[PDB]
Amino acid sequence: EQYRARPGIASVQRATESAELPMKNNDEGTPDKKGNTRGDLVNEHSEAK
Amino acid sequence: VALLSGKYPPDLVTNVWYADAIYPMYADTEVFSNLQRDMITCEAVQTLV
Amino acid sequence: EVLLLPIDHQPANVTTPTLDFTNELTNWRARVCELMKNLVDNQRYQPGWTQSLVSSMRGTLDKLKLIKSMTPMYLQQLAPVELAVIAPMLPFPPFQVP
Amino acid sequence: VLLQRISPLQIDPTIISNTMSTLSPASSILGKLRPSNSDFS
Amino acid sequence: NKKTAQLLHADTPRLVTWDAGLCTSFKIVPIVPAQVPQDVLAYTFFTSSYAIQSPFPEAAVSRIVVHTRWASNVDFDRDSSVIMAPPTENNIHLFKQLLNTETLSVRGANPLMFRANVLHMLLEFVLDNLYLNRHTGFSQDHTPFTEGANLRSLPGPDAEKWYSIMYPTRMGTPNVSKICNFVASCVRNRVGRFDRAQMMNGAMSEWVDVFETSDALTVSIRGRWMARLARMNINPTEIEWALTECAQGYVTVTSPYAPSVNRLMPYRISNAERQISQIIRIMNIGNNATVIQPVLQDISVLLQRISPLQIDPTIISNTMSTVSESTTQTLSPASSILGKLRPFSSFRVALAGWLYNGVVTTVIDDSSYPKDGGSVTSLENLWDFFILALALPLTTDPCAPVKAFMTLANMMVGFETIPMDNQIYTQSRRASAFSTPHTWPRCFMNIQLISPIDAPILRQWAEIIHRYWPNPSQIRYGAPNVFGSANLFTPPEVLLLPIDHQPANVTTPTLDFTNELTNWRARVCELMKNLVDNQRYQPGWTQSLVSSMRGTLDKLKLIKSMTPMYLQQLAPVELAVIAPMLPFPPFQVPYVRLDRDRVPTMVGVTRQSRDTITQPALSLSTTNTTVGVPLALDARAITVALLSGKYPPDLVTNVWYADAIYPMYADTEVFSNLQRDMITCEAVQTLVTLVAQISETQYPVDRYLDWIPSLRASAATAATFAEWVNTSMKTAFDLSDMLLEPLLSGDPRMTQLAIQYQQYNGRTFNVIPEMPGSVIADCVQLTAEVFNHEYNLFGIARGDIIIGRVQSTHLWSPLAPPPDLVFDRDTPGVHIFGRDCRISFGMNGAAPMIRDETGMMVPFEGNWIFPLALWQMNTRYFNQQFDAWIKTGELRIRIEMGAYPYMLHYYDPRQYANAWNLTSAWLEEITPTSIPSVPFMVPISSDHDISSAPAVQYIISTEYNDRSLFCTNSSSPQTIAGPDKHIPVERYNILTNPDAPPTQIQLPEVVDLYNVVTRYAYETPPITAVVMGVP
DSSP: OOOOOSSOHHHHHHHHHHHHSOOOOOOTTOBOTTSOBOSOOOOHHHHHO | OTTTSEEOOTTOOHHHHHHHHHHHHHTTOOHHHHHHHHHHHHHHHHHHO | OOOOOSSOOOOOOTTOOSSOTTSHHHHHHHHHHHHHHHHHHSOTTOOSOOSOOHHHHHHHHHHHHTOOOOHHHHHHHHHHHHHHHHGGGOSSOOOOOO | OTGGGTOOOEEOTHHHHHHHOOOOHHHHHHHHHOTTOOOOO | OHHHHHHHOOOOOOOOOEEOSOOOSEEEEEEEEOOOSOSSSOGGGSGGGGTOOOSSOOEEEEEEEEBTTSSOOBSSOOOOOOBOOOTTSOOGGGSSSSSTTSOOOSSEEOGGGHHHHHHHHHHHHHHTTOOEEBOOOEEEOOSTTTTSOEEEOOOSSSOTTHHHHSOGGGSOOOSOSHHHHHHHTSOTTOOEEEEEOOOSTTSOOSEEEEEESOOHHHHHHHHHHHHHHHHHBOOHHHHHHHHHHHTTTSSOEEOOOSOOOOBOOBOOOOHHHHHHHHHHHHHTTTTOHHHHHHHHHHHHHHHHHHOOOEEOTHHHHHHHTTOOOOTTOSOOHHHHHHHHHOOOHHHHHHHHHTTOTTTEEEEEOGGGSOSSOOOTTOHHHHHHHHHHHHHGGGSOOTTHHHHHHHHHHHHHTTTSOOOOSSSSSOTTSOGGGOOSGGGSOHHHHSGGGSOTTTOHHHHHHHHHHHHHSOOOEEEEOOOHHHHOOOOSSSOTTEEEESSOOOOOSOSSOOOOOOSHHHHHHHHHHHHHHHHHSOTTTGGGSOHHHHHHHHHHHHHHHTOOOOHHHHHHHTHHHHHHHHGGGOSSOOOOOOOOSSOGGGOEEEEEEESOOOSSOOOHHHHGGGSOEEOOEEEEEOHHHHHHHHHSEEOOTTOOHHHHHHHHHGGGGGOTHHHHHHHHHHHHHHHHHHHHHHHHHHSOOSSOOOOOOTTSOOOOOOHHHHHHHHHHHHHHHHHHHTOOSOSSTTTOSSOOTTOOOEEEEEETTSOEEEEOOOOOOOHHHHHHHHHHHHHHHHGGGGTEEEEEEEEEEEEESOOOOTTSOOGGGOOOTTSTTOEEOOSSOOEEOOOTTOOOEEEOSSSOEEESOEEEEEEHHHHHTTHHHHHHHHHHHHHTSSEEEEEEEEEEEEEEEEEOTTSOEEOHHHHHHHHHTOOSSOEEOEEEEEEOOBSSOOOOOOEEEEEEESSOOGGGEEEESTTSSOOOBSOOOOOOGGGGHHHHOTTSOTTOOOTTTOOOSSEEEEEEOOBOOOHHHHSEEOO
């Protein structure tokens, strides 16, 4: 084992390890089994900001 | 600044470098699983309507 | 099978010259410099400048124009490849508009 | 980030520093670029 | 400031170096000891048993090895040696010293870096041999071994050893030993001193030619080195003349007239060489004022010390103490002017600036103009105008005239008005702003636009500027027969001046007003006086103030200052007399008066080229970096200088200067600088020539190391390479400052030197310097050409290798295998492997198979061809899949390498020996970044019947590589088993072939190890030692 990767294996792993991660679920705005929409009572413009 | 001061390593050899860059990165690939999900995500939509 | 790019891409080749005005980006660097030069040359656009800064202002631009950055080289040869080597594995596939 | 450590390109501001070699137009541009700052996100 | 210093005094290279030892770089070493004592030849047979000292090693095996200056005895170490170890020890470390920063293993090196490394190696091989062969002394032979020859004596104790390695023809020949046989067959008469040049009875011989061990290569190198210096030599008389010419006669030196003893004094270089460095010089300074300023200050002082002129302000105060005026008055022309003059640095500097207007443009400091612009109603401002008018004309600023004009125009606002060009550069814009041609107002060039009625004064001021502004001139300086010429845009010996110089015809000065600048003062005053007596301005002053103002102006006009005179008669000379001694020679651009069309608007230098442009002249216009900066001076001071100059009472120029200058011409720093320039240029070319071996340049060039692999080189690897070439040079010449650094900016693959300047009308002037030769460069390329043959001697093997099992009792050298064992791409039934190669595992007993290059799938057996890279990129997988078949199976692979370092392992032929363990390690330690020296297992040659025994081998070469071998059983009568090799006669041609001239060499195919060497003993005295001055 006289080889040292370049770029390093560790380096690249950790890096792709976080790219792997799927984007977060965005409940806000949808209804729950009871029929009430979830989220906070905030203006659409304000929320965006 | 970035555009103004870039340089490669003097001992660069693409064929080797990228090989070492892809291996660890592809070894953690999730393509396959995402494909399966994409399949359901659809079935779901279809069912709903 | 397509991946759009807002740049022109070329075949990879590390032997490429640093001052290759064939490279779109490198040329821009130049053109923008020579423009400024023309602008500052007659000092018609900068009264209230007590001493002649043409000499210096020029060289200063010349230095930037001819700086040996390999970034453009990369942004046109490897960058594109790298992006392509990733796209497929990404969790959120690309979504472009021409 | 992935892109950064999968890429053979290295950013080294000193290049600018060494080319300027220094009202001074030369110094102005330098103070404007700020080579010491290593963030390139 | 690191640059600043280098301008004033750059480290001078160490050119002359001497070597009293042997001029050889190859040594014969013992690998396997002799077979003595033995069971057949009685010990009483071997010479070694009688303590006889032999010319060559007495051993079973001996090989040649590279080792620069192993026998040399020098005065200065160029610390750039190349030392190899016997092939039986690992040498890998010599071929990984460069780009293997990423190479992990210590026993390994990266092959794609081979050429780069080898190249640099040869560069040092040369650098480390750059010496002059010194002559020592002799002694006649008191024995009959030679016919009373004169044997040269090496210095140092423990010398008796050399006399036997030195002359082989001297040994006795009692034996029938391989050695004696050689010796015995050599011509007797070619040993010891051969010929000499004895000129002075009882002094040393000027030089001597002599036979003795050495190597044709390094001998040739040193030969051309001396050749190059021999061209730079100058003699006392030439120096007498040169110096005498520079001093313009004020100083007189002397040279002797009689038979000398030959002196080597290298100083004369070509103009080309001077220009090239004067460009490099300019390069690293352009735009950075703080680098050139200290240079001017220096000259500033130099002047002050030599000039007989002295500034004494009391002059102004005295004449002013007699101005007539009333005490009941509010203003005092007399007082105000004194308080404005506040009665030097700036004066002396302004003069110095005349010598470098190429890169430095002096200008009057903004702070010297009235804050608001001034008003002709303010006595204070009227003096402000005066001060400026008198000073401007001494600056190199080509726009001074327009400023001198506007300066008044600014004060006249509302009083007298003129038609300006536009709404931006208005009649009220600070005069100090009209700094470029494009700004010269129309009315300033076409005076007629100024109304003689609505603007009388302003007009007259313009007419004056036009008719009385100083007319530039010139003066000849220097002596190029020795110093060459650093002038770039002007002719040699020419020194331009922004003033008219009319040499003085006398040596006993007297006040004189018939000067260019004296009139200028006059006119300026007369103008003022008119502005005052102006029918529509004079009514605003008390009738008394006018009288006073007039009186004062008159006293200023008629003031007895010498400055104007000095500036016309002496100043120019002083400069001309200094110029030749400056470290940074003058760099000028024509001084045009009011011919704006010819005003300089740009000066730039190139040191690289573009895309596909290969001709300097074409890329120059678009690849230059502009140069130059402004330096501000204090108008106040300058005027005071022009107003209060004074000469010593009983001055006598012809004497005064004879004293003042003498000491300045006892500073040989000048000559030293030449030697530097000499190197600076060798360095440059050496770069391009080497760089062109690893990359593609625009220069025509040799090429001999193309067979040694090398990576695809990027502008980065290029620079990194350059950086080493640089270092090594400095190191070998003992330089601590800069060299090539200025050119190293980014990418060096297209370096080129040229400079140009441009006029306002757009006409441009180019200056491409003619590249002179290079000995350093030529010598590298020479040894490279030899490397292409004697490569084995440098620890490098050529060709490829073949990993395959070969068991037998035979005794051939694996480095000289037998034909039928090697195969190549064009051999029948051979399989080549390319990129798409993959492996499909076997199943249910079937065999596994690897893919062909044509898409055929074969089993693990037969003869394959693998390019090294292919294995490297799959070491593990391959070693795992193939090793087993290579060892005990029927698979044989030929790895394509091109060139590779090798290491030998000798063994006793009578005992079993299996090389697997050795080659197993090799294969297993191959990486996509490294490979260890290829190991070969070779048999020990014997000098007597010996039993035999099996030997299993796995690695052999593709072509002969045993050229490193010098001799076997050198002390025995003959080698009976194993490789037999008798002392290589070819290498001792001068001795073995009687019909050959003594002076014949065989490069570049064969390096002779015994030649005729010329040893000098020339003296290297300091100039001050032979050229004497007459105080």
